[PDB]
Amino acid sequence: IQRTPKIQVYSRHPAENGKSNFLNCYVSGFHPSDIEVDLLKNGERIEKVEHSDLSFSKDWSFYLLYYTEFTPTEKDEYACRVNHVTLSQPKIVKWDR
Amino acid sequence: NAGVTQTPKFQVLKTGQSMTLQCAQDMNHNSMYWYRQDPGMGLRLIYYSASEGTTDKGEVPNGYNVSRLNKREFSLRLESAAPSQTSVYFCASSVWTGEGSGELFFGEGSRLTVLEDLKNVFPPEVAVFEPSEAEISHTQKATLVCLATGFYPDHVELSWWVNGKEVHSGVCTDPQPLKEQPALNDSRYALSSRLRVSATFWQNPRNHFRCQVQFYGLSENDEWTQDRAKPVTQIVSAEAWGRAD
Amino acid sequence: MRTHSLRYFRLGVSDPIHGVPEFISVGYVDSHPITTYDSVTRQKEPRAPWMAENLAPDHWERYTQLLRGWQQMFKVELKRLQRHYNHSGSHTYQRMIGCELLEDGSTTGFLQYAYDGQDFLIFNKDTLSWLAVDNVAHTIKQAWEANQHELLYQKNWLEEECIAWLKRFLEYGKDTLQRTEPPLVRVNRKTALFCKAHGFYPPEIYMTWMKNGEEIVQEIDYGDILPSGDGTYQAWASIELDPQSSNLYSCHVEHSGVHMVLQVP
Amino acid sequence: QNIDQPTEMTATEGAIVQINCTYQTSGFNGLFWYQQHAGEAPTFLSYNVLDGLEEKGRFSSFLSRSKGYSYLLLKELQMKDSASYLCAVKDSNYQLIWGAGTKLIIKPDIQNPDPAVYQLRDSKSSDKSVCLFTDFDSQTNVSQSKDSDVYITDKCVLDMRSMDFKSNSAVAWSNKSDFACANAFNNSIIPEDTFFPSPE
Ligand code: NA
């Protein structure tokens, strides 16, 4: 069985425009552990992206937290791009504020 | 099905010599060990090798080192031998380390003796002593005795050989040697042994008894400067024949 | 204390890619990675600072050696499993072991193995027997059950030695693990009602919606508990609002001994 | 960490003996007993990890983790059980801690005691004379010589399996010219009925 990733794009704090925050992309429930995660800024991949190490679940799936420090603005559109063996092409999940 | 094979069974060493002991296991185990056994102490690990590709120190690693040659061979080296390193060293093997009920399979042993000088090494003086006539009359059986005396170190294997084949029934050899001078730190030892046959067996004049003692001492490389004969490894027998009368 | 747990996970991959390891091992107190090891670094290293500060290098030296051995044991078991399944390609072998120390002092223990992310073998420390999910796993069950001593071994470790560790680790990260940060809860409109909660530790929180005093568990749409990234978590739980008739909705939040109710007007 | 077992134990053939092993350790992952005959390599005897008693043949091992103590129980003792029995405890990090061992020493059941001190024929290749204390009951102990040029060994148990026969024996020698069999074992407490055969 190959379980396909569940992606969720959210902010560390309730985001008020202008105030610094953190954008989080938490991938979980997937198997096997091979995975490539990127944070996008208006369609382009952000440079300095931090992330946790691969974590394990009681149900034998994995999970990862990819984050980045940013300042949310009204003009900017953020998303998360995950590739996996269970997906024909990269999947995009936009940050819906 | 050989088990754990370590060599040498016996060695004598001069302070400062190099020395490498060998150990092999044919059991396709993964964890191998080197212990040393001393009087009064429980076994103590020297080094261990959890898996073919790793090693690590044990409780008392100072003045030793090892090398995991492969999956079957784990070798102990003594860089600069020292009188404190005199002990019996056992090799051991188990399928895995960390497994809780996995026991240790041990090898035969290595009896090592680091000495200051070598001028204290001595082969044994063997001598057979025939049964008492009083004894045969009173018990109708016959006890011979074999005295191996004046040897140093305790590197001796005594064996009885009636009619040319080895025998163990009716034998009692002391389980530990006797210090001839209990005060001296470097005394020579004496080992006694009995063979007790039936009085009919002794009274056949055509039965031949031989008490042989295998001593482990020096090799060709060991420099010798003393007047007496160099005490190399040797076998020193004594025999006795049946007495009919 | 609350209910705490200690876990070790081991992961093996049959024919990994270039960068992927072949063996990974990570340890968890509650939800915190505490220890890590892999077939690349070949070293067991701490993952919580309070782990580094109270376990001496002797500890990390001893366990570095042990995982190296386990890494190879885990490869041997994997090769075996994959041959009995007649499977080509890259496949996944997983092990999890650990215990829980409940609030009222009772304890639990578990040990189980996985193959390609499914259950394979689940240990029962009370009947002292393995549960096999198929016949490849049946073969391993009989081999392991023949060595009765190694079953009694795992029982003692799960019930005494796992728990003994857990207590020690709790004092090592007391400040981290026994702290309580209660949550900030609001309600928003999106036509649905969203009950959002954030800023809380530990991560165990129940959030439901109630209609006029009765719960609607099939109508509630539950969110997942997500890490924020500063040590706290955030979750939400929504319901769909009826357009034909009004209703007294009320979000309920339980967390770390305190229960709060948000009535919407 | 610390393990304690007693140094040596003496019992009688065909009886029961209990070898205690207490320990205080960092954790606990199982208890082992190892048998080691004198001069030889230890082999695995028993393994205990949960409380209770485990029978394996005519050997039994017990464990109380709470009291932190195991004992080895040997039933119907035979001579071949005269060895050292080593106790070993696996600690929290799976390090074996070893106790010093216990030397188990069996007295054989002597059916018909016949204590005597015989003079053995001189050997033309040695200057020593040799006395042989033999056939005494297991309740007799052999004392180390007091004179510096006489040598007494500790007793030894001999079995002629062809006659199913067991006897104890000590040996004393010396090359000093005062030495005699009648006087060799005076430092020892010998049976009253010991047979001294007239000299030649
Ligand atoms: Na060393």
Coordinates of N, CA and C in Angstrom, one line a residue, chain B residues 30 48 50-51 53-57 96-102, chain C residues 42 61-62 65-66 68-70 72-74 76 147 149-150 153:
Chain B
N30 N 27.5 -12.6 15.4 CA 27.9 -11.3 15.1 C 28.6 -10.5 16.2
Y48 N 35.2 -5.2 22.8 CA 34.1 -6.0 22.2 C 33.9 -5.5 20.8
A50 N 30.5 -5.5 18.5 CA 29.0 -5.8 18.4 C 28.6 -6.4 17.1
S51 N 29.3 -6.0 16.0 CA 28.9 -6.4 14.7 C 30.2 -6.3 13.8
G53 N 32.2 -4.7 11.8 CA 32.4 -3.3 11.3 C 32.5 -2.3 12.4
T54 N 32.4 -2.8 13.6 CA 32.5 -1.9 14.8 C 33.3 -2.6 15.9
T55 N 34.0 -1.8 16.7 CA 34.6 -2.2 17.9 C 34.5 -1.2 19.0
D56 N 34.7 -1.5 20.3 CA 34.7 -0.5 21.3 C 35.3 -1.1 22.6
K57 N 35.8 -0.2 23.4 CA 36.5 -0.6 24.6 C 35.5 -1.1 25.7
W96 N 23.9 -11.9 18.8 CA 23.7 -10.5 18.8 C 24.0 -9.9 20.2
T97 N 24.4 -8.6 20.2 CA 24.5 -7.9 21.4 C 23.2 -7.1 21.5
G98 N 22.7 -6.8 22.8 CA 21.4 -6.2 23.0 C 20.3 -7.2 23.2
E99 N 20.3 -8.3 22.5 CA 19.4 -9.4 22.8 C 19.5 -9.9 24.2
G100 N 18.4 -10.0 24.9 CA 18.4 -10.2 26.3 C 18.7 -11.6 26.8
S101 N 18.3 -12.6 26.1 CA 18.5 -14.0 26.4 C 19.7 -14.6 25.6
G102 N 20.2 -13.9 24.6 CA 21.4 -14.4 23.9 C 22.5 -14.6 24.8
Chain C
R42 N 25.9 6.9 11.3 CA 26.4 5.8 12.1 C 26.7 6.2 13.6
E61 N 28.1 6.6 23.6 CA 29.1 5.6 23.0 C 28.5 4.2 23.0
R62 N 28.0 3.8 24.1 CA 27.4 2.4 24.2 C 26.3 2.2 23.2
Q65 N 27.2 1.9 19.4 CA 27.6 0.5 19.1 C 26.4 -0.3 18.9
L66 N 25.4 -0.3 19.8 CA 24.3 -1.1 19.8 C 23.4 -0.9 18.5
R68 N 24.4 0.2 15.5 CA 25.2 -0.4 14.4 C 24.9 -1.9 14.3
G69 N 24.9 -2.6 15.4 CA 24.5 -4.0 15.4 C 23.1 -4.2 15.0
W70 N 22.2 -3.3 15.6 CA 20.8 -3.5 15.2 C 20.5 -3.1 13.8
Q72 N 22.4 -3.8 11.3 CA 22.7 -5.0 10.5 C 21.7 -6.1 10.8
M73 N 21.2 -6.2 12.1 CA 20.1 -7.1 12.3 C 18.9 -6.8 11.6
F74 N 18.6 -5.4 11.5 CA 17.4 -5.0 10.7 C 17.6 -5.3 9.2
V76 N 19.3 -7.9 8.0 CA 19.1 -9.3 7.8 C 17.6 -9.7 7.8
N147 N 11.6 -19.6 21.2 CA 12.6 -19.1 22.1 C 11.8 -18.4 23.2
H149 N 12.4 -17.8 26.2 CA 13.1 -16.9 27.0 C 13.1 -15.5 26.5
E150 N 13.2 -15.3 25.1 CA 13.2 -14.0 24.5 C 11.9 -13.3 24.6
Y153 N 11.8 -12.0 28.1 CA 12.7 -10.9 28.1 C 11.9 -9.6 27.7

